[PDB]
């Protein structure tokens, strides 16, 4: 069945899933730049772009 | 909006304005001639022409 899955394989699958969840997130957070807020919504904070 | 200024930039703007107010007035007062006046109300005064 295409709509179905075998339960005894659940853990195996979930595990591998988490493994990719990690692999796919292995990056360094890069810094971009800002601009001061020209409105009064915030007290002149620096919003990242 | 074309019309309308931004209040948070008021002092900033005003200051600059005062700066030009000074710069535009940085001159020496030149001495020009006069004329001896005999109008009844300013009799004998030397008005600068």
């Amino acid at each position: 069945s295409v709509r179905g899955a075998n339960p005894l394989m659940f853990r195996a699958n979930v595990l591998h899933m988490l493994l990719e969840f990690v692999l796919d997130n292995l990056y360094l957070n890069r810094h971009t730049g800002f601009s001061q807020d020209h409105t009064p919504f915030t007290e002149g904070a620096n919003l990242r772009s």
Side-chain angles (χ1 to χ4, degrees), chain A residues 28-37 45-49:
Chain A
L28 286 185
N29 295 297
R30 192 168 190 70
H31 159 222
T32 45
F34 311 76
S35 41
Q36 178 159 53
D37 194 316
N46 282 289
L47 289 42
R48 168 162 159 267
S49 166

Side-chain angles (χ1 to χ4, degrees), chain A residues 15-41:
Chain A
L15 272 168
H16 180 271
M17 180 173 103
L18 304 195
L19 170 56
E20 284 196 338
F21 180 89
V22 178
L23 291 182
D24 196 29
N25 266 294
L26 288 173
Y27 294 79
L28 286 185
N29 295 297
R30 192 168 190 70
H31 159 222
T32 45
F34 311 76
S35 41
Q36 178 159 53
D37 194 316
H38 274 42
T39 79
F41 284 80

